[PDB]
Amino acid sequence: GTKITFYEDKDFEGRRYDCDCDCADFHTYLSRCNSIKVEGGTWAVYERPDFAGYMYILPEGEYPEYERWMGLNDRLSSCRAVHLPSGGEYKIQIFEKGDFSGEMYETTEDCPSIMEEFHMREIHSCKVLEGVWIFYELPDYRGRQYLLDKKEYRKPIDWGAASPAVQSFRRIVE
Template sequence: MRFRCLDYSAGALQYPPAHVSLKAIACGTFHNLTLATGDPLEEEDLEAASQASEDESSGESEEKPREKHGEDVEADVWNLQGGEECTQERIDFQLSFDKSESKSCSQRAFKIIFYEDRNFQGRHYECNSDSADLSPYFSRCNSIRVESDWWVIYERPNYMGYQYVLSRGEYPDYQRWMGFNDSIGSCRSYPHYRGGNYRMRIYERPDFGGQMMEFMDDCPAVYDCFRYRDIHSCQVMDGYWIFYEHPNYRGRQYFLRPGEYRRYGDWGGYNSTIGSFRRMRDF
């Protein structure tokens, strides 16, 4: 729905500023109610509401325009769905509804909390979605709480640098997530894997060449199983996996989801050395 508030020739308001503001408020209120109820108006209802609003404005134009406050505003705000005046009680209800919805969404949405100091002290930032740049929110990170899902956090913005894979729990200092420093620049979330199967193939050479082995379970020492210390490519068929630079799940971490990785750079690796890997689960 649109209201013509500007004259076609000179760009001047057709109605007094106060009336134009009321139309904008009414449109916003109607928009919120429509989103909340999921019940949009039919086209004929919109035309009737628009005509009713214009009829009222033409009647008001005969009087001297004046600023409106308090009860005057209440009388001019329209319920566009039925052409009836909104009472202050209805307006208050809508405002309280919007606030309660916003509050409940914020309470249940955030999934990870970053703290600048150890033991969950200092300034903190609550995050509920992927973020390519966390630098505006904190300068360092020494402890983390993960409320739900799995998260991959990165040392630098744009998902670059060291990777750290975190499951739900508390991390009072960065050594707990095997961090190399207190720098966190970006993060991504992943829902828990609901499937029961994990399956991955690793290859001796790039582009799935050379010796190949298929795994369905954790591997604490790649050389003992594969007889090679390097993995140049892999295919993840089922589940999420984590590569580690050294045996026994130590060193740099690399997160892998289902897909093809033709070279070690595809999973963010600095070289092809992989000492261990395991399925991504709640550790």
């Protein structure tokens, strides 16, 4: 029962497009997106078609302007719903060095500052043991977002990053 609606203008005005599960290209129906309503569930929305470019995570809610999903602009073209397992536990292992090496830290908690908590500004590999997580380039859940749907991540490119810069992360909780 999850649904997201994109609107071409701010404040939920103008032409709109509805997605119910995974839409690899709505650019043909909307040339821009300046407000979004997320009715149920959590969604990943993407700048370019086929889930490419900058990514933004939107939990349920109303977003009357693109700044409210921390967007860079009104350019969005594809989206997929974030499917969470039940159970309700979250666990991540973050590594100082590539290929699950160097200092390891394991945590079940949101981390708004990797520097203050783990004394690193970079993550070079990672194992998500339980749940679903977001990595952020900057502290306090700012900057480039990356979605980590469990499994193992040998190198930053495996979570979509061009570099190991990660400075906060948090769980996607329904």
